[PDB]
Amino acid sequence: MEDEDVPVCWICNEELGNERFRACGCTGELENVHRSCLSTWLTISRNTACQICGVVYNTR
Ligand SMILES: [Zn+2]
Numbered sequence: 001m002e003d004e005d006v007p008v009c010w011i012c013n014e015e016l017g018n019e020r021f022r023a024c025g026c027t028g029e030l031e032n033v034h035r036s037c038l039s040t041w042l043t044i045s046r047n048t049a050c051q052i053c054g055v056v057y058n059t060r
């Protein structure tokens, strides 16, 4: 039960607790990120997949 604690979106630095958004499978903050600012961020920064592990954001 180590999943406890609330993760924070590495983009806007805000706790999400469990925003269901498969955008990457890293081992740090990236593992948890709001699909709101991430999906839109990569769109503004022009990105389709995490440049840390090579996983696509896959946003709705
Ligand atoms: Zn990643």
Ligand SMILES: [Zn+2]
Pocket: 009, 010, 011, 012, 013, 014, 033, 034, 037, 038
């Ligand atoms: Zn966020």
